[PDB]
Amino acid sequence: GETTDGVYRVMTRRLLGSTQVGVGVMQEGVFHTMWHVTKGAALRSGEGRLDPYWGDVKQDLVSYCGPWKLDAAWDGLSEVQLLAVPPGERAKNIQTLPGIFKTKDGDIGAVALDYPAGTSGSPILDKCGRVIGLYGNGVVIKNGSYVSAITQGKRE
Amino acid sequence: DMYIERAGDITWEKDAEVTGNSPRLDVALDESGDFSLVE
Numbered sequence A: 001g002e003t004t005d006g007v008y009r010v011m012t013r014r015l016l017g018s019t020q021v022g023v024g025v026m027q028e029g030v031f032h033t034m035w036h037v038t039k040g041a042a043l044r045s046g047e048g049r050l051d052p053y054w055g056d057v058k059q060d061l062v063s064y065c066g067p068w069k070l071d072a073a074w075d076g077l078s079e080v081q082l083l084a085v086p087p088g089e090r091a092k093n094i095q096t097l098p099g100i101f102k103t104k105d106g107d108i109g110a111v112a113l114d115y116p117a118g119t120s121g122s123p124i125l126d127k128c129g130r131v132i133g134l135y136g137n138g139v140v141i142k143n144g145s146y147v148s149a150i151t152q153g154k155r156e
Numbered sequence B: 001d002m003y004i005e006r007a008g009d010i011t012w013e014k015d016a017e018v019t020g021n022s023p024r025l026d027v028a029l030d031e032s033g034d035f036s037l038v039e
Protein backbone atom coordinates (compact mmCIF):
# COMPACT_ATOMS: atom_id res chain seq x y z
CA GLY A 1 0.00 0.00 0.00
CA GLU A 2 0.78 3.78 -0.14
CA THR A 3 2.73 4.76 3.06
CA THR A 4 3.93 8.26 2.04
CA ASP A 5 3.37 10.76 4.88
CA GLY A 6 0.20 12.85 4.36
CA VAL A 7 -3.59 13.22 4.84
CA TYR A 8 -5.88 10.43 3.53
CA ARG A 9 -9.61 9.93 3.02
CA VAL A 10 -11.31 6.88 4.66
CA MET A 11 -13.93 5.39 2.28
CA THR A 12 -16.47 2.51 2.33
CA ARG A 13 -18.41 0.75 -0.51
CA ARG A 14 -20.85 -0.94 1.99
CA LEU A 15 -23.38 1.90 1.32
CA LEU A 16 -24.62 3.64 -1.88
CA GLY A 17 -21.61 4.29 -4.23
CA SER A 18 -18.28 5.13 -2.47
CA THR A 19 -18.97 7.08 0.77
CA GLN A 20 -16.32 9.01 2.78
CA VAL A 21 -16.75 8.06 6.47
CA GLY A 22 -13.69 10.09 7.68
CA VAL A 23 -9.98 11.16 7.26
CA GLY A 24 -6.59 10.34 8.82
CA VAL A 25 -2.89 11.03 9.09
CA MET A 26 -0.06 8.88 7.76
CA GLN A 27 3.17 9.62 9.70
CA GLU A 28 6.29 7.43 10.16
CA GLY A 29 4.46 4.37 8.62
CA VAL A 30 1.50 4.67 11.11
CA PHE A 31 -2.07 5.58 10.11
CA HIS A 32 -3.89 7.78 12.69
CA THR A 33 -7.70 8.36 12.77
CA MET A 34 -10.67 8.72 15.17
CA TRP A 35 -12.17 5.52 16.60
CA HIS A 36 -15.77 6.54 15.58
CA VAL A 37 -14.57 6.58 11.85
CA THR A 38 -13.36 2.92 11.60
CA LYS A 39 -14.81 1.41 14.84
CA GLY A 40 -11.35 -0.33 14.88
CA ALA A 41 -11.90 -2.31 11.57
CA ALA A 42 -8.98 -3.15 9.25
CA LEU A 43 -8.31 -0.88 6.23
CA ARG A 44 -7.12 -1.46 2.69
CA SER A 45 -4.43 0.70 1.00
CA GLY A 46 -4.54 -0.53 -2.66
CA GLU A 47 -3.84 -4.29 -2.26
CA GLY A 48 -2.16 -3.81 1.21
CA ARG A 49 -3.96 -4.39 4.57
CA LEU A 50 -3.63 -2.01 7.56
CA ASP A 51 -4.37 -3.70 10.91
CA PRO A 52 -5.32 -1.80 14.10
CA TYR A 53 -2.41 -1.51 16.56
CA TRP A 54 -3.69 0.77 19.40
CA GLY A 55 -7.13 2.29 20.17
CA ASP A 56 -9.23 3.90 22.94
CA VAL A 57 -13.03 4.57 22.64
CA LYS A 58 -12.86 7.23 25.38
CA GLN A 59 -9.96 9.17 23.68
CA ASP A 60 -11.87 8.39 20.37
CA LEU A 61 -8.45 7.58 18.67
CA VAL A 62 -6.92 4.61 16.79
CA SER A 63 -3.53 3.85 15.18
CA TYR A 64 -2.74 1.29 12.42
CA CYS A 65 0.59 -0.53 11.70
CA GLY A 66 2.29 0.81 14.89
CA PRO A 67 1.94 2.99 18.01
CA TRP A 68 0.48 6.59 17.96
CA LYS A 69 3.32 8.89 16.65
CA LEU A 70 1.73 12.42 16.91
CA ASP A 71 2.83 14.31 20.03
CA ALA A 72 2.69 18.03 19.20
CA ALA A 73 0.41 20.20 21.40
CA TRP A 74 -1.57 23.45 20.94
CA ASP A 75 0.50 26.29 22.55
CA GLY A 76 -2.77 27.75 24.10
CA LEU A 77 -2.08 31.16 22.41
CA SER A 78 -1.68 30.93 18.61
CA GLU A 79 -4.06 30.44 15.61
CA VAL A 80 -4.03 26.89 14.11
CA GLN A 81 -5.14 25.40 10.74
CA LEU A 82 -7.81 22.66 10.21
CA LEU A 83 -6.69 20.86 7.07
CA ALA A 84 -10.30 20.02 6.23
CA VAL A 85 -10.79 17.11 3.81
CA PRO A 86 -14.64 17.18 3.22
CA PRO A 87 -16.46 14.40 1.29
CA GLY A 88 -16.00 14.92 -2.52
CA GLU A 89 -14.08 18.25 -2.03
CA ARG A 90 -10.37 19.20 -2.23
CA ALA A 91 -8.26 19.35 0.99
CA LYS A 92 -8.50 23.05 2.18
CA ASN A 93 -6.60 24.92 5.01
CA ILE A 94 -8.85 26.95 7.40
CA GLN A 95 -7.01 29.15 9.96
CA THR A 96 -8.77 29.70 13.39
CA LEU A 97 -8.08 30.69 17.02
CA PRO A 98 -9.14 27.71 19.16
CA GLY A 99 -11.54 28.07 22.10
CA ILE A 100 -11.33 25.90 25.23
CA PHE A 101 -13.25 22.90 26.55
CA LYS A 102 -13.12 23.17 30.39
CA THR A 103 -13.39 19.68 31.93
CA LYS A 104 -13.00 18.24 35.48
CA ASP A 105 -9.66 16.68 34.27
CA GLY A 106 -8.26 19.79 32.49
CA ASP A 107 -8.66 22.27 29.61
CA ILE A 108 -8.55 21.10 25.93
CA GLY A 109 -8.25 23.31 22.75
CA ALA A 110 -11.45 23.34 20.64
CA VAL A 111 -12.19 24.52 17.04
CA ALA A 112 -15.60 26.05 16.06
CA LEU A 113 -15.70 25.02 12.34
CA ASP A 114 -18.75 23.15 10.88
CA TYR A 115 -18.01 20.39 8.31
CA PRO A 116 -19.88 17.21 7.32
CA ALA A 117 -19.39 14.27 9.73
CA GLY A 118 -17.28 12.44 7.04
CA THR A 119 -14.60 15.21 7.72
CA SER A 120 -13.88 13.45 11.10
CA GLY A 121 -10.07 12.80 11.51
CA SER A 122 -8.91 15.80 9.51
CA PRO A 123 -5.67 17.14 11.12
CA ILE A 124 -5.24 20.40 13.10
CA LEU A 125 -1.74 21.93 12.58
CA ASP A 126 0.54 24.48 14.24
CA LYS A 127 2.72 27.03 12.33
CA CYS A 128 5.56 24.47 11.84
CA GLY A 129 3.06 22.06 10.11
CA ARG A 130 2.98 19.62 13.07
CA VAL A 131 -0.29 17.71 13.82
CA ILE A 132 -1.51 18.90 17.27
CA GLY A 133 -4.67 16.63 17.03
CA LEU A 134 -7.64 15.44 14.99
CA TYR A 135 -10.96 17.16 14.36
CA GLY A 136 -14.40 15.50 14.77
CA ASN A 137 -15.08 14.63 18.42
CA GLY A 138 -16.96 17.54 20.24
CA VAL A 139 -20.41 19.01 20.96
CA VAL A 140 -23.48 20.72 19.36
CA ILE A 141 -23.85 24.25 20.89
CA LYS A 142 -26.83 26.57 21.74
CA ASN A 143 -26.64 27.83 18.09
CA GLY A 144 -26.94 24.28 16.59
CA SER A 145 -23.32 24.60 15.23
CA TYR A 146 -20.48 22.04 15.90
CA VAL A 147 -17.41 22.67 18.13
CA SER A 148 -14.72 19.95 17.97
CA ALA A 149 -12.03 19.17 20.58
CA ILE A 150 -8.38 19.25 19.34
CA THR A 151 -8.05 15.49 20.17
CA GLN A 152 -4.31 14.34 20.59
CA GLY A 153 -2.92 10.92 21.60
CA LYS A 154 0.23 10.11 23.65
CA ARG A 155 3.51 8.92 21.99
CA GLU A 156 4.91 6.03 24.18
CA ASP B 1 -14.03 -3.11 3.57
CA MET B 2 -12.83 0.44 4.29
CA TYR B 3 -9.99 1.78 2.14
CA ILE B 4 -7.77 4.89 2.24
CA GLU B 5 -6.93 7.42 -0.59
CA ARG B 6 -4.20 10.14 -0.32
CA ALA B 7 -5.72 13.69 -0.22
CA GLY B 8 -2.69 15.98 0.37
CA ASP B 9 0.55 16.89 2.17
CA ILE B 10 0.36 18.20 5.76
CA THR B 11 1.58 21.82 5.46
CA TRP B 12 0.89 25.25 6.97
CA GLU B 13 -0.46 27.51 4.13
CA LYS B 14 0.27 31.30 4.35
CA ASP B 15 -2.91 33.42 3.88
CA ALA B 16 -5.39 30.59 4.19
CA GLU B 17 -9.15 31.78 4.68
CA VAL B 18 -9.27 32.80 8.50
CA THR B 19 -12.64 32.08 10.25
CA GLY B 20 -14.38 30.53 13.31
CA ASN B 21 -14.91 31.94 16.83
CA SER B 22 -13.11 30.78 20.07
CA PRO B 23 -15.77 29.68 22.59
CA ARG B 24 -14.97 28.75 26.24
CA LEU B 25 -17.35 25.81 27.05
CA ASP B 26 -17.81 23.71 30.25
CA VAL B 27 -17.88 20.09 29.05
CA ALA B 28 -18.05 16.51 30.40
CA LEU B 29 -16.52 13.44 28.71
CA ASP B 30 -18.30 10.09 29.28
CA GLU B 31 -16.92 6.54 29.14
CA SER B 32 -18.25 6.15 25.50
CA GLY B 33 -16.03 9.15 24.43
CA ASP B 34 -19.02 11.56 23.97
CA PHE B 35 -18.63 15.19 25.05
CA SER B 36 -21.68 16.96 26.56
CA LEU B 37 -22.26 20.59 27.73
CA VAL B 38 -22.21 21.00 31.56
CA GLU B 39 -24.48 24.08 32.02
Ligand SMILES: COCc1cc(-c2ccccc2C(=O)Nc2cnn(C)c2)ccn1
Binding pocket: A036, A114, A115, A116, A117, A118, A119, A120, A135, A136, A137, A138, A140, A146, A148
Ligand atom coordinates in the same frame (compact mmCIF):
# COMPACT_ATOMS: atom_id res chain seq x y z
C1 LIG C 1 -24.84 13.55 11.05
O1 LIG C 1 -24.51 14.84 10.55
C2 LIG C 1 -24.80 15.89 11.47
C3 LIG C 1 -23.77 15.95 12.58
C4 LIG C 1 -22.41 15.99 12.32
C5 LIG C 1 -21.50 16.00 13.38
C6 LIG C 1 -20.03 16.06 13.15
C7 LIG C 1 -19.52 17.20 12.52
C8 LIG C 1 -18.16 17.35 12.28
C9 LIG C 1 -17.29 16.36 12.66
C10 LIG C 1 -17.76 15.23 13.29
C11 LIG C 1 -19.13 15.06 13.55
C12 LIG C 1 -19.57 13.78 14.21
O2 LIG C 1 -20.54 13.17 13.78
N1 LIG C 1 -18.84 13.32 15.28
C13 LIG C 1 -19.12 12.08 15.89
C14 LIG C 1 -20.01 11.12 15.36
N2 LIG C 1 -20.09 10.04 16.12
N3 LIG C 1 -19.25 10.28 17.17
C15 LIG C 1 -19.16 9.23 18.17
C16 LIG C 1 -18.65 11.49 17.08
C17 LIG C 1 -22.02 16.00 14.67
C18 LIG C 1 -23.39 15.96 14.85
N4 LIG C 1 -24.26 15.93 13.83
